[PDB]
Protein backbone atom coordinates (compact mmCIF):
# COMPACT_ATOMS: atom_id res chain seq x y z
CA UNK A 1 0.00 0.00 0.00
CA UNK A 2 3.13 2.22 -0.10
CA UNK A 3 3.66 2.08 -3.89
CA UNK A 4 4.90 4.96 -6.08
CA UNK A 5 1.21 5.57 -6.90
CA UNK A 6 -0.19 5.37 -3.36
CA UNK A 7 -1.92 8.10 -1.33
CA UNK A 8 -2.99 8.65 2.32
CA UNK A 9 -6.55 7.81 1.36
CA UNK A 10 -5.29 4.79 -0.60
CA UNK A 11 -3.69 3.41 2.52
CA UNK A 12 -7.14 3.36 4.16
CA UNK A 13 -9.29 2.66 1.07
CA UNK A 14 -7.29 -0.34 -0.18
CA UNK A 15 -7.86 -1.98 3.24
CA UNK A 16 -11.55 -0.97 3.39
CA UNK A 17 -12.25 -2.51 -0.03
CA UNK A 18 -10.33 -5.57 1.20
CA UNK A 19 -12.56 -6.08 4.25
CA UNK A 20 -15.75 -5.10 2.42
CA UNK A 21 -16.88 -5.76 -1.18
CA UNK A 22 -18.22 -2.27 -1.96
CA UNK A 23 -16.71 0.25 -4.40
CA UNK A 24 -13.60 2.31 -3.46
CA UNK A 25 -15.62 5.44 -4.14
CA UNK A 26 -17.85 4.54 -1.16
CA UNK A 27 -14.81 3.73 1.02
CA UNK A 28 -13.63 7.36 0.75
CA UNK A 29 -17.10 8.51 1.84
CA UNK A 30 -17.11 6.04 4.76
CA UNK A 31 -13.80 7.50 6.02
CA UNK A 32 -14.64 11.20 5.53
CA UNK A 33 -17.03 10.57 8.46
CA UNK A 34 -14.65 9.10 11.08
CA UNK A 35 -11.29 10.91 10.76
CA UNK A 36 -10.11 8.20 8.32
CA UNK A 37 -9.84 5.44 10.95
CA UNK A 38 -10.62 2.02 9.41
CA UNK A 39 -11.29 0.77 12.96
CA UNK A 40 -14.09 3.38 13.22
CA UNK A 41 -15.27 3.22 9.59
CA UNK A 42 -15.93 -0.47 8.93
CA UNK A 43 -18.41 -0.53 11.84
CA UNK A 44 -20.47 2.25 10.25
CA UNK A 45 -20.65 0.05 7.14
CA UNK A 46 -21.45 -3.04 9.23
CA UNK A 47 -24.32 -1.02 10.75
CA UNK A 48 -25.77 0.40 7.52
CA UNK A 49 -24.69 -1.89 4.64
CA UNK A 50 -24.21 -5.30 6.32
CA UNK A 51 -25.42 -8.35 4.34
CA UNK A 52 -27.07 -10.03 7.36
CA UNK A 53 -28.49 -9.29 10.83
CA UNK A 54 -29.09 -12.74 12.37
CA UNK A 55 -27.52 -16.21 12.57
CA UNK A 56 -30.21 -18.13 14.46
CA UNK A 57 -32.41 -18.79 11.38
UniProtKB/Swiss-Prot annotation:
Phosphoserine modification sites are 7
Residues forming the UBA-like domain are 9-46
Entry's Gene Ontology cellular component terms = ubiquitin ligase complex
What UniProt keywords apply to this chain's record, in alphabetical order?
Answer: Phosphoprotein, Ubl conjugation pathway
Can you cite a GO biological process for this protein?
A: protein neddylation
- Presence of keyword Phosphoprotein: yes
Q: MF terms per GO, please?
A: cullin family protein binding; protein-macromolecule adaptor activity; ubiquitin conjugating enzyme binding; ubiquitin-like protein binding
Q: Which residues form a coiled coil?
A: none
Function, as annotated, reads: Required for neddylation of cullin components of SCF-type E3 ubiquitin ligase complexes. Neddylation of cullins play an essential role in the regulation of SCF-type complexes activity. Does not act by preventing deneddylation, but rather facilitates neddylation, possibly by acting with HRT1/RBX1 to recruit the Nedd8-charged E2 UBC12 to the cullin component of SCF-type complexes.
**Subunit structure as annotated in this protein's UniProt entry:** Interacts with the cullin CDC53. Interacts with ubiquitin via its UBA-like domain. Interacts with RUB1/NEDD8.
**Protein known as:** Defective in cullin neddylation protein 1
Name the source organism: Saccharomyces cerevisiae (strain ATCC 204508 / S288c) (Baker's yeast)
Q: Which gene encodes it?
A: DCN1
